[PDB]
A paper describes a structure:
Orai was identified as the protein that forms the channel’s pore and STIM was identified as its regulator. The channel is activated by the depletion of Ca2+ from the endoplasmic reticulum (ER), and as such it was characterized as the calcium release-activated calcium (CRAC) channel responsible for store-operated calcium entry (SOCE) before the molecular components were known. The channel is formed from an assembly of six Orai subunits that surround a single ion pore, which is perpendicular to the plasma membrane in a cellular setting. Each Orai subunit contains four transmembrane helices (M1-M4) and a cytosolic M4-ext helix.
In this study, we introduced the corresponding amino acid substitution into Drosophila Orai (H206A), confirmed that it generates a constitutively active channel, and determined its X-ray structure. Thus, as has been shown for the corresponding H134A mutation of human Orai1, H206A Oraicryst forms an open channel that recapitulates properties of STIM-activated Orai. Extensive optimization of crystallization conditions improved the quality of H206A Oraicryst crystals from an initial diffraction limit of 20 Å resolution to 6.7 Å resolution. In this case, the asymmetric unit contains 24 Orai subunits, which are arranged as four complete channels. The X-ray structure of H206A Oraicryst reveals a new conformation of the channel with a dilated pore that presumably represents an open conformation. In comparison to the closed pore, the pore is dramatically dilated on its cytosolic end, expanding by ~10 Å at Lys159. The electron density indicates that the principal conformational change in the pore results from an outward rigid body rotation of the M1-M4a portion of each subunit away from the central axis and a slight additional outward bend of M1 on its intracellular half. Residue 206 is located on the M2 helix and does not line the pore. In the H206A Oraicryst structure, M4b and M4-ext are repositioned by straightenings of both bends such that the regions corresponding to M4a, M4b and M4-ext of each subunit form a continuous α-helix that traverses the membrane and extends ~45 Å into the cytosolic space. Anomalous difference electron density for iron is not observed in the structure of H206A Oraicryst, indicating that the iron complex is not present in the open pore, which is in accord with the dramatic widening of the basic region.
Numbering used by the authors:
A (entry chain B), B (entry chain C), C (entry chain D), D (entry chain E), E (entry chain F), F (entry chain A): 148 to 180, 191 to 219, 240 to 327
Write the structure that this text describes.
Amino acid sequence: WRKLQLSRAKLKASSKTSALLSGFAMVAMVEVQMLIAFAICTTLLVAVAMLALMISTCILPNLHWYIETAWAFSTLLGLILFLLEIAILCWVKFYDLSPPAAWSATVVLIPVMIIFMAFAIHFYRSLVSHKYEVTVSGIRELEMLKEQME
Amino acid sequence: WRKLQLSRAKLKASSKTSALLSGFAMVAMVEVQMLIAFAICTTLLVAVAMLALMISTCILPNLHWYIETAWAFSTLLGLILFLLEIAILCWVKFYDLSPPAAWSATVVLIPVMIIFMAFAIHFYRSLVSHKYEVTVSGIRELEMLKEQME
Amino acid sequence: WRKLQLSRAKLKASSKTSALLSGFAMVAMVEVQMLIAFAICTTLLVAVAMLALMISTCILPNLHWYIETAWAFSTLLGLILFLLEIAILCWVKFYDLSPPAAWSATVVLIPVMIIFMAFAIHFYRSLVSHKYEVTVSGIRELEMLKEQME
Amino acid sequence: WRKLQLSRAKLKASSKTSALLSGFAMVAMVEVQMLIAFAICTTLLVAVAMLALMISTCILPNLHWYIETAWAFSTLLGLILFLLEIAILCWVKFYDLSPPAAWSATVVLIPVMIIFMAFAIHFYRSLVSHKYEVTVSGIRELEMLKEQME
Amino acid sequence: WRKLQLSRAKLKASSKTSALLSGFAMVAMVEVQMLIAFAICTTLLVAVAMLALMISTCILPNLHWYIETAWAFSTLLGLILFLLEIAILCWVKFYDLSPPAAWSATVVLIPVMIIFMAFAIHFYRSLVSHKYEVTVSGIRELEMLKEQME
Amino acid sequence: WRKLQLSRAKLKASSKTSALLSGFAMVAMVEVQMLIAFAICTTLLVAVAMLALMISTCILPNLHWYIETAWAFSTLLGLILFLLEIAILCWVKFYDLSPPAAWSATVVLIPVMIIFMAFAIHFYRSLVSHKYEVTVSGIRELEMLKEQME
């Protein structure tokens, strides 16, 4: 039961989060009109969303942890992209007459981008340790019962 | 009971997903203003949505698997279109002064587009294997009872 | 009980579907600025929605099948209009510098428009047949009881 | 109990319906920039909404039918205004280069506007008749109990 | 229990109502570009919302009537501002070439603005009377029990 | 149980509040096009949101008070930023031809900004006192039981 809920929380969370961001990016992209990177970041980011969306289409009809990875990865990947795209936008909006102000965007981006990925590693690190922590405590308890059994 | 839920999940999911994307595409289309393809992709994509919408209008009043196909097909079909349309937009925004950057959009599109359709086949393949697999598991037991029966 | 639910499903479904589409059409209409038809399609489409909206206002306070027709008709009518309006938009956005690409919009429109209305007839046809089908099967059963009754 | 629900359905329905329409009208108004009427219709329509909004703020804390009238009136009044404003918009967006097409907007407006108000009268008429229809049937039943009482 | 609900109804109601209006005002403000007043009204109105938002952040963690005042005041205060800002917008959109039409906006504003604040006083007035009305009826009943007690 | 709810209320509240504000800021930023500060405020504000978003991604899978701080801090921090950004916008829209009207924005900003942060301290101050207030009342009750125990 806990398995389905985990996925469902992932199902709707991704769809709504992904669709609104892609639409906002598309609307802002047509308004203003590094140079080449802009076209790629936008198109690719959208795809990350599309797949997660379909995941929602196929999940209900139907290993559980495997598909789980697809969502956490795709969704988390996008977050980096959204902030990634905005950094470029400032470069696009200012890059013309405002280049001076534009630099502050990409430069300030590095401090936050690192913390975001770095924090993800720390949270994940503590988690793995627990997987091993439970494995040790679990076998120890089984020996206590097996020893008194004799 | 499970039959109605499957459709309902399809009923609302399609409507909301379809209406927002079509509106965003229409808004961005009027802002910027391959050449001919742009007009077609937009208009057609909308239709895919419209039908699915009506499906919601007729389903509640009222074979179940048949209609089911219409939704999975129409919805999945649209996803390819949305990402399909954005690729063209970059070409519409850059195609003028930025043609160089525009190419990265359609090119990068191929890698993701293939994986999307390809993954769909794999998921479907595993599903079919089970449908038949079960058919074998069910009858097998029946023969067991039959032999012991007599 | 089933009667109220059928209407309620119609009550909210129409309001949300109608209001968002009219607003999107109004926003895109002011951005770009067959010629005369454009003004009519937009204004009329909105009205179809407005009435359905009020239907929601008057229904709760308060023959059931009669009002039911108004919703199914108005809502379905709009779907044709939305796709109808977009076809014109392509003709409006392109009609200036892109007239060549514009034709593909209206032409491609015919294939989908027909299928939409045509499919509606088929679904409705099967429904009517069943209504009669049940009417015959029902009376036949009552005669079986009435005959053995003697 | 039925009394509170009727109002609540009115409470949220008005707020959401009113706020989104006013914002859309304000956004489109600044984009394009009968002549004088435009400014009035927009500002006034908003007010109709604002009051209804506050009605929601004061209702929860705290004759019931009296306040009820304020909502039905304000909300219904707005619907006429929204379609009213769009008619003017076409006159504003086309009034420049497209004056010819503009006329089709106001003219086509008359057919729907009449039906909207006319239909409201019919629905209300049937309602009043029932109120009296029940008053007659009710007293009749009481006399049946009073007569057999003797 | 009734205390928490009253606040919660206030918690979400304010956040959604405030955030959407501020964003719409900001979007329309950048599109057009009394003169000085415009900048102030917009910035200040936003603040009124921000505080109410935080109120939602601090309320859940944790006198009840005191905080209650902050919401009713801030929210109601904003309503006047929104209609206030729109009156200025008409003056901003028309103030250039359309000054004549602009006047109708601010002038027509006075009639509705007064009724809004005036009606608020009346509703509040009747409320204060009841508070006292209950205080009198309550003590009277307690004496009835205390008298027969002897 | 109360622990999970507190976080959940924080989970969705932050995501919706953060995503809409960042999109509105991005849309308005591209429309108009202190000078350098504008680029930074926008980019940084977004980051504050992104992290909070991920917090929602990692919380469900899995000390409680620690993570709690991250949300209250990030969310509250943003509020100051949103109003902060708008102050700059007025300076961006007016800063060109309207510099005079622009000053009223930043100046008026100080009065509200202080109250916002100042009020936060007061609410927090009363809270801390209670933490100590309970600590004293609690130990006192335990002694009452321990004393009569002898």
